[PDB]
Amino acid sequence: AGEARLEEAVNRWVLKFYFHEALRAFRGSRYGDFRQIRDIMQALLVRPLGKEHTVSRLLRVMQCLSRIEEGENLDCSFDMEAELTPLESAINVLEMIKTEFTLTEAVVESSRKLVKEAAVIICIKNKEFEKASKILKKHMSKDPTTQKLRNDLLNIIREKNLAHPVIQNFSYETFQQKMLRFLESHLDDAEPYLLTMAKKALKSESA
Template sequence: MEGGGCRASEGAAEAREKALEEAVNRWTGPFYVHQALQAFRAGRSRDFRQLRDVVSAVLARPLAQEKCIGIQLQIVQFLSKIDENWTIDPKTKLMPLEDALVILDKMKDELDLNIEVVEEIRKKIKEAVSVSISSSVGTDDCFSA
């Protein structure tokens, strides 16, 4: 009988530990999301990427899922695509800004977002893609006779 009681108390201890970690992560996740958003706004790309990685690590641990955490994660994913370089994703065959548009559409479908704001963001991303492509092509090199 002693072995059964010991296993039961170990199971209870593990359950308490998991509940504690879920509670801590419920607070640390949004904290690091907030820090990442501040870094993005300030143009601190390196800090943003590091904080995004911390957020990903927290989300990989036990976490009581709440709707707001999912929304925050989508925002960080969206901003990550805007922050990335211009390499094409081998899985999706999309450039990061194109991938950001896909995430934006998903957010629009899943969340109660203002359609006018979404369309303005979409317009600005498309303008950024156009400007970046134009500047990277170098028209002098391509069309010189």
């Protein structure tokens, strides 16, 4: 009863502390640490957290980042249906973020363009041309402002031109960091309670 209220409070503190450390690892390109921290958070989810809309946003972000971090591994499946590559799965999470964070198409569009682009190109690098075409056609926009990129890609899949500048100039690292940038902007900048108490406590000590 009370013991569960108290556990809830701690669990949320734990969750927020690790989320903060997960973003820091991600920002520092320490993806190994990111994944391990991600697993700790995954384990905490079966426990009572209560309600904060702060954690749902928190969790939607982790969700998207987790899929983006494993984006270059087409052996991974974050979904019921094996079909979905991690990035395709990231697109779906982004759509959930749009709806839940009540964001406009214009705001989510830039992010999305980057994820769709990355999804197609990673498939192309693995010469999963057929898969790249399907992803391109279902997701890719046909906007007048993206039609050239879409045509280049469609053509690259055509000739299987893995040597095309579009493919060679693609930086997954930059892609990842830009995505973190965007997702990060829908979160508060505060220091999680535990890190605060850890900075205090840690300086009780000395010498």
